[PDB]
Amino acid sequence: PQITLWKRPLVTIRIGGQLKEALLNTGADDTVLEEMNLPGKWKPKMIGGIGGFIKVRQYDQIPVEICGHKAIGTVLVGPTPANIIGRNLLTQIGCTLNF
Amino acid sequence: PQITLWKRPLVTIRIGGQLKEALLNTGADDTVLEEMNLPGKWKPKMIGGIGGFIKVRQYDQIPVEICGHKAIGTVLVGPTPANIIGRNLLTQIGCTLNF
């Protein structure tokens, strides 16, 4: 679908069998979700944001359905202010910016 | 134009008489530019995201051209690790997300 930007680009996603709301973020290299449990192994990682750096847990090859579109990739979990869908998964569902 | 997300969506913008490289950022409503000495009055403001909050200067009614597309609105200037073009200006140039 085509999404305008007058309002936040919020969408419903499915991960680990649970539904959640996330923000389509073209300004994010990765997909970062608020604290939650995810099956499998994870590795410690550090990422940067507008206010500085934080520590997160990196889960690889995780299935994520975004607005009915399937993606399987890296998902970071940590103290993010909101669940965000970054470029790593946006590219998987064929999302582009247009003007 | 159509910008894919394989890499950070960087574009050239014109502001305060300068040409800069900025990232189209659907994850923010505000537009934040790296420290620059813009003339005019401003108001203090605090913005937050991953890592916490930073202090910036808010300038209003500032003309900003994005890839030849004219816009005008609020621009925040401060110690951001990157020039960010938010939804406030993205809507002005008719930018959408499509998949």
Binding site: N25, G27, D30, I84 | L23, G27, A28, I47, G49
Partner: peptide, 8 residues
């Protein structure tokens, strides 16, 4: 290194 810019 990874950069992510959501703003609240």
């Amino acid at each position: 290194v990874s950069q992510n810019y959501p703003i609240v």
